Amino acid sequence: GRPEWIWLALGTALMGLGTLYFLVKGMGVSDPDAKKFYAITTLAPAIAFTMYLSMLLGYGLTMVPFGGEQNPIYWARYADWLFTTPLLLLDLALLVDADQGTILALVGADGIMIGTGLVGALTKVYSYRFVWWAISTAAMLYILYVLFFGFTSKAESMRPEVASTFKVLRNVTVVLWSAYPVVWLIGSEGAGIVPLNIETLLFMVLDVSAKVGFGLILLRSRAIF
Template structure:
């Protein structure tokens, strides 16, 4: 690993630490937002920063043929991305009883997506690598469908204010999540249009926005909500 990569990884760790401290500080004045929301927002940067710290000290990395696989990224994603979906689900069902089937469906599809991505990255055969990559994309499409159909419908049933917040949070997360397989594909794990240093930098910048950035948007949006839904829901 080059020195510039180590530098960027430590920047990431520092940002995650700052994010964890910020979310912990918000929890002292919850403003009607359940404690679990703050706990989830706190765990995400703590775990992600820990995973990236392991890479910064030269762990969480394995050579597969002529390619380096940062498997610590997947150890990060398999924990933090389901938590991001749980957070989005709690926002989408903020005023109502939580639908466990929707939440478990999102988490299961997400874990499947992350693990197929890891298998793809550990596979030296190109046809098999893209087979696993494609399976991960199918899981991503399922996640996006759940986010934008059944879960969004529930958010819309609770009034315009919550529906607006949900659309912002879901749109923000969806755009960033589509970037992950795109960067994977153009990087050393895929067709190699960008080198390892660029790949590392991109996988530092993107998770900062998709983890800390999302939680800032989500938590502060929830803290600004009324204590009960407005009287003009978008749907019955």
């Protein structure tokens, strides 16, 4: 057992409770719109959980040579994010009745963001790793921009209950998402300042808040109906 296993086991559990809790709740609703929010928001933690459980069994980890040592890299995150991040975005988009072309672009951006962050994490030349990280972040700030400006202004043209739920969900997403690039920069994938075990703790906290925490705020609100 690697020092960080405690945090993988604790994400596993929390994603697990979150997935089943949402599954149940959503299975009892008959409203066709609420069902759609549920399927999507249940699928996120579902994908998370199977990927955290994978990591807890020691898969999804490779050694990458850079700055003269063998650094450990949990590529399994990216497998998870790749599919979970668009899923969250989609929620926000359904919520504000956003245009088809906005969604494609956001997903577009998102693929870019995760794609590059991964290549970042696998690059053997130390310098270049930061070239990818900076592209990934650029792609991300593009996303947040559109959420904050684009989506909010769409939210205005909906009921107060829907708009004010979006805002909460918007704020939560802007706080968590903007932590990730910093964690990566200071963690084992970047500067190797914060060790792997603490890096995992921070990602789990962010992973869980952003899927269990989000789902809970969204799924309890009248605005899904």
